[PDB]
């Protein structure tokens, strides 16, 4: 019993479909470092996001196809977590240590940046403008507190430095995952689908046309686990598309690959800076800059950098950093996600408002223009509807904002032949614009709140009622007490399937057993038939009592 | 404390009127709707403060001429000479006044910054007056729906599944009034409650085999005696119980 208790965390168990028609149970070893890396909060958050998006967007037919991909991505991330874990050579080692320090404390730098922005704004809360020095006016900090201006200067410098550290850290730990995902997707597309061989991408596909740059670059499979994708594509499509055309498209040399296949040399790489710069692939760097610039978080951080530099140029610009609270706190993100859920419908609704108010201006310029005199003095009238530019601007700026429509601002229509017509005009403008459209605006936000809440509830219920791997309902396992918990924690646990991949990858091919070799060979062929979908061990041997 | 202060000054007793909220049950339910999303509400007012502060920042640097609230020409009263007064004015007047801050601010017609001020007023009207108050109302409405859905779910779960064994009502519904008989005689909650006292009171030497077995398992914090997933009727369905 003591040995089993000691080795319980390291004993992983999974279930596979099997070479035969019977579900088979597989036992293997889980490394301590693998479990330590898996339990990291970042990995936990990534797994939560993956589960949420998979459940919400469905994709049942591709479920396993997504899951395996997730595992691959996650593995790369924790490799980075292993790498960034806690004359020329001296500066290089200082640079790598500094980069690692920035990578480790990125979130702390974000928190410090938010706090520094709050402090800078609180200091700026004491500005005052006066004509006399402390013809145009001057600005100065009017306060009785000492050394406030030097403190503000130091806070500005520290804020910019910390934000720059944020930029460098984010480039250190987040970009390689995006690059790896893009390389993986492009490799799958050009190896199986052949989107560039005997097929072309669509013109509207911006990313499809952008991915054409790294086709012939020597560093194409960089930042990705596989480095022989181009050779496999050549072997797959040379006999049809033409070996020479494939070589030119992928930038390969048949003689070079042949001689390296026979035997390769081991030249010494020069550590010089000039030769290193010469060895930099310009096209690959251009493609990497293009893909990284399309990211949202990187653009947000670049905007934060620009705001910091403008803050050095003019201190008041730092006020913009207050909006980072929306990106900072999670409840901020949720409540503003309600607004962003129906954003297209919202810009929609304001456009419809503009059109209907334009029609009201059209019918107000042709007949009811006399009633638009906003000048009290009789000597100099001020007609706001002499031309439709002023009339439409007046209706847009005054009629929409003023409660009760445009009739309140417009003169009294009593005592005129068009009094009934003007009454209909004002009442219909009040109902159609002030009431209905703003009601739509509020209803969109309320519906978005309900939508997000329903999505979260559906995800929770789906997770709590059905198993992720086999899909069998919780009731059948609930026949036996705590059956569902045992099934979801021991038999078909997600972490066990994740760990089995690494256990296959680390150990040598000659050490794989029959089951391990079978799973590995079917994995290579992108075949997901080993997952026990629709069946499990318990019902396989229900008569035999397992 | 309120009562003692009421003795000190009688008017303090007015505070006790708020006890109606704690007193009547419907009071508690309707205010539970408000308290359901309280963090989201203090949230939303904080975001309001930040966005109005940004509007004051862009109103202190350029559009400060239009903040003269004094009718007399001899003694002007600028409300945006410093950002303390400008921010207080926007917080206290702009938010409360329907239509944004443009109504209180002077007429921008006839100036080079008239279009810029039009954008300023219209965007302050939409972003502050419309969107944020819409969020405030939507949170309360969503909380009402949340509590109602919770009560409905609890009622349905109680009325459809048995609490002890968890078997659905349909299987018992095969026999007429089967679910009622099962939930009133076989797996009644009160019977399980009473059995614990019946075991605690009687002496240990008087316990039978079944009573002694349940008692020992209870003492070891083991809950395997509860018939979860099985019951008498399906145990002897072939034998007709
Ligand atoms: C987005 C909503 C838009 C509609 C808002 C409706 C609110 C107001 C509704 C009604 C008040 C109508 C005006 C007062 C009556 C005047 C009579 C008249 O038009 O005869 C004219 C002749 O005929 C024409 O020139 C064309 C006749 C139709 C004009 C447009 C009517 C729009 C109806 C829309 C249907 C809406 C139904 C109900 C909607 C709730 C006389 O014109 P005049 O004096 O000889 O010349 C004038 C100068 N002019 C040459 C420049 C033209
Ligand atoms: C929460 C919402 C916040 C934003 C509300 C926006 C409403 C209003 C929008 C627009 C009206 C803008 C003002 C009128 C035009 C003036 C030109 C100008 O700025 O040039 C200036 C030079 O340049 C600078 O000093 C910096 C330029 C940018 C200033 C800040 C713009 C904010 C944009 C936000 C993006 C919003 C996009 C749309 C949002 C719906 C000229 O300045 P000056 O006269 O030489 O010196 C003045 C005194 N000073 C030294 C103290 C500075
Ligand atoms: N094959 C499966 N593997 C794991 N969990 C499963 C599987 N199928 C269903 N589940 C669900 O997983 C739930 C348990 O979640 P789990 O223990 O994985 O949470 P977690 O990721 O540790 O949580 P947290 O969000 O706190 O980090 C069960 O309630 C069950 O409904
Ligand atoms: N094991 C169980 N024991 C008792 N009731 C159960 C059980 N499982 C489910 N129920 C549900 O409880 C309901 C009966 O509730 P009950 O008769 O206890 O109401 P009550 O609590 O006496 O009424 P009140 O709330 O007014 O006191 C049944 O409709 C049944 O669906
Ligand atoms: C098959 N395979 C993988 O699936 C893999 C990997 N590194 C990460 N992953 C996910 N390597 C090196 C690999 O050969
Ligand atoms: Ca072997
Ligand atoms: Ca006895
Ligand atoms: Zn399962
Ligand atoms: Zn029962």
Swiss-Prot record, chain A:
**Phosphotyrosine: residues carrying this PTM:** 372
User: Which amino acid positions bind Ca(2+), per UniProt?
Assistant: 510
Please provide the record's free-text comment about the domains of this protein: The calcium release channel activity resides in the C-terminal region while the remaining part of the protein constitutes the 'foot' structure spanning the junctional gap between the sarcoplasmic reticulum (SR) and the T-tubule. Pore opening is mediated via the cytoplasmic calcium-binding domains that mediate a small rotation of the channel-forming transmembrane regions that then leads to channel opening.
- Spell out where the chain crosses the membrane: 106-126, 150-170, 289-311, 313-329, 345-365, 429-449
Residues the entry annotates as binding caffeine: 225
The residue ranges for the Cytoplasmic side of the membrane come to 171-288, 330-344, 450-546
Coiled coil location: none
The organism's superkingdom is given as Eukaryota
Family of the protein in this entry: Belongs to the ryanodine receptor (TC 1.A.3.1) family. RYR1 subfamily.
Which spans are intramembrane here?
389-408
Gene coding for it: RYR1
Q: Which residues lie on this side of the membrane: Lumenal?
A: 312, 366-388, 409-428
Function statement: Cytosolic calcium-activated calcium channel that mediates the release of Ca(2+) from the sarcoplasmic reticulum into the cytosol and thereby plays a key role in triggering muscle contraction following depolarization of T-tubules. Repeated very high-level exercise increases the open probability of the channel and leads to Ca(2+) leaking into the cytoplasm. Can also mediate the release of Ca(2+) from intracellular stores in neurons, and may thereby promote prolonged Ca(2+) signaling in the brain. Required for normal embryonic development of muscle fibers and skeletal muscle.
Provide the assembly information.
Answer: Homotetramer. Can also form heterotetramers with RYR2. Identified in a complex composed of RYR1, PDE4D, PKA, FKBP1A and protein phosphatase 1 (PP1). Repeated very high-level exercise decreases interaction with PDE4D and protein phosphatase 1 (PP1). Interacts with CALM; CALM with bound calcium inhibits the RYR1 channel activity. Interacts with S100A1. Interacts with FKBP1A; this stabilizes the closed conformation of the channel. Interacts with CACNA1S; interaction with CACNA1S is important for activation of the RYR1 channel. Interacts with CACNB1.
- Protein name in the entry: Ryanodine receptor 1
Additional comment: Binding of [3H]ryanodine indicates that the heterozygous channel is activated by Ca(2+) concentrations 4-fold lower than normal. Single-cell analysis of cotransfected cells shows a significantly increased resting cytoplasmic Ca(2+) level and a significantly reduced luminal Ca(2+) level.
Q: Where in the cell is it found?
A: Sarcoplasmic reticulum membrane
**Positions of modified residues (Phosphoserine):** 375
Posttranslational mods? The N-terminus is blocked. Channel activity is modulated by phosphorylation.
Motif Selectivity filter: positions: 403-409
Found, by tissue, as follows: Detected in skeletal muscle (at protein level). Fast- or slow-twitch skeletal muscle.
Where ATP binds, per the record, is at 44-48, 463-468, 488-494
């Amino acid at each position: 019993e003591s040995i089993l208790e000691y080795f319980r965390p390291y004993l992983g168990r999974i279930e596979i479909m099997g070479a035969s028609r019977r579900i088979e149970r597989i036992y293997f070893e889980i490394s301590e470092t693998n479990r330590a890396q898996w339990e990291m909060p970042q990995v936990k958050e990534s797994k939560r996001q993956f589960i949420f998006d998979v459940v919400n967007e469905g994709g049942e037919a591709e479920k396993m196809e997504l899951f395996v991909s997730f595992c691959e991505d996650t593995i790369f991330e924790m490799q980075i977590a292993a790498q960034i874990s806690e004359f020329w050579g001296e500066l290089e080692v200082q640079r790598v240590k500094f980069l690692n320090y920035l990578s480790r404390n990125f979130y702390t730098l974000r928190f410090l940046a938010l706090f520094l922005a709050f402090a800078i704004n609180f200091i700026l809360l004491f500005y005052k403008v006066s004509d006399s020095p402390p013809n145009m006016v001057y600005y100065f900090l009017e306060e009785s507190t000492g050394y406030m201006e030097p403190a503000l200067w130091c806070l500005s410098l520290l804020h910019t430095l910390v934000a720059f550290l944020c930029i460098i850290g984010y480039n250190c730990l987040k970009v390689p995952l995006v690059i790896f995902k893009r390389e993986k997707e492009l490799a799958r597309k050009l190896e199986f689908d052949g989107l560039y061989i005997t097929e072309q991408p669509g013109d509207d596909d911006v990313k499809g046309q952008w991915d054409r740059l790294v086709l012939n670059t020597p560093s194409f499979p960089s930042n990705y686990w596989d480095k022989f994708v181009k050779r496999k594509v050549l072997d797959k499509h040379g006999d049809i598309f033409g070996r020479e055309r494939i070589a030119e498209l992928l930038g390969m040399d048949l003689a070079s690959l042949e001689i390296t296949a026979h035997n390769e040399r081991k030249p010494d790489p020069p550590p010089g800076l000039l030769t290193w710069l010469m060895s930099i692939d310009v096209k690959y760097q251009i493609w990497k800059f293009g893909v990284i610039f399309t990211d949202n978080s990187f653009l947000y951080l670049g905007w934060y950098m620009v705001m910091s530099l403008l803050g050095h140029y003019n201190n008041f610009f730092f006020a913009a950093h207050l909006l980072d609270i929306a990106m900072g706190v999670k409840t901020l993100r949720t409540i503003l996600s309600s607004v962003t859920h129906n954003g297209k419908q919202l810009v929609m609704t304001v456009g419809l408002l503009a059109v209907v108010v334009y029609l009201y201006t059209v019918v107000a310029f042709n007949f009811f223009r006399k009633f638009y005199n906003k000048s009290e003095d009789e000597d100099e009238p001020d007609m706001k509807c002499d031309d439709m530019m002023t009339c439409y601007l007046f209706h847009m700026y005054v009629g929409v904002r003023a409660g009760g429509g445009i009739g309140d601002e417009i003169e009294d229509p009593a005592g005129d032949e068009y009094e009934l017509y003007r009454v209909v005009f004002d009442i219909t403008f009040f109902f159609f614009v002030i009431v209905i459209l703003l009601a739509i605006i509020q209803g969109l936000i309320i519906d978005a709140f309900g939508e997000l809440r329903d999505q979260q509830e559906q995800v929770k219920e789906d997770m709590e009622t059905k198993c992720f791997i086999c899909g069998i309902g919780s009731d059948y396992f609930d026949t036996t007490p705590h059956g569902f918990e045992t099934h979801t924690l021991e038999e078909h646990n997600l972490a066990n399937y994740m760990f089995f991949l690494m256990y296959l990858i680390n150990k040598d091919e000659t050490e794989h057993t029959g089951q391990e070799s079978y799973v590995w060979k079917m994995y290579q062929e992108r075949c997901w038939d080993f997952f026990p979908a629709g069946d499990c061990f318990r019902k396989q041997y229900e008569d035999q009592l397992s």
